[PDB]
Amino acid sequence: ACTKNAIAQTGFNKDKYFNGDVWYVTDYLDLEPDDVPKRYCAALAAGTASGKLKEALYHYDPKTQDTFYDVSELQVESLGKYTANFKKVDKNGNVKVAVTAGNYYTFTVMYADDSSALIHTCLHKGNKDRGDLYAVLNRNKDAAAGDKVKSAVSAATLEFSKFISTKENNCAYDNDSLKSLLTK
């Protein structure tokens, strides 16, 4: 189960974060052992569509090739802290698994600037016991983590040396699909 109440960035700028552009995961930290594969790739687009906060997600396992997309409408708990009911879609936005109660993730933006972010997410899905996940994001694919986000990791009392890099996986990203999905 998840164990952390992540604190959102003071003065979080929602319009900048939810601007329709893509964020690449560059490094991640799962608190539960073996909760996720050690080699993985992920990215998301966050934006507004007709006034609603939306995210589109992309997951890619660079070994098994397992690939999936999700779209969510986000509901506000407080500034920088959201609850998202996800639907699994193909890259075109065609629904493969409908939204269902109990299938949701929370999402807290702990730090963000115009090129980087630190987030926490707690995934709830079916009958699987899942733990907290932290992710360092960048606007640029595979960018090395800068001093601002690394300092934020420290300030959150986390050790960046424990984060797993995604940058050395042979991963490709369909940023056009992610952007398009925001409306789906």
Tell me which residue has tokens 């999700």: 70
Residue 39 in contact with ligand HEM, rule: CB under 6 A: no
Distances (CA, A) of 83 to 73, 132, 139, 149, 170: 8, 14, 23, 23, 31
CB of 68 to ligand HEM, least distance (A): 6
What are the residues whose beta carbons fall under 8 Å from the beta carbon of 45, sequence distance 6 or more? 20, 21, 22, 23, 55, 56, 175, 178, 179, 181, 182
Segment near ligand HEM (CB under 6 A); pick from 10-18, 75-83, 120-128, 145-153: 120-128
CB of 35 to ligand HEM, least distance (A): 8
Q: Of how many residues is the chain composed?
A: 184
Token pair for residue 75? 């509901």
Residue 59 in contact with ligand HEM, rule: CB under 6 A: yes
Which CB atom, from 135 or from 150, has the smaller least distance to ligand HEM? Answer: 135
Strands 41-49 and 22-30: antiparallel
What are the residues whose beta carbons fall under 8 Å from the beta carbon of 10, sequence distance 6 or more? none
Which CB atom, from 100 or from 151, has the smaller least distance to ligand HEM? Answer: 100
Which one of 92, 125, 151, 176 is in contact with ligand HEM (CB under 6 A)?
Answer: 125
Binding residue ranges for heme: 59
Binding site for ligand HEM (CB under 6 A): 25, 28, 36-37, 40, 42, 44, 57, 59, 68, 70, 86, 88, 97, 105, 107, 121, 123, 125, 128, 135, 166
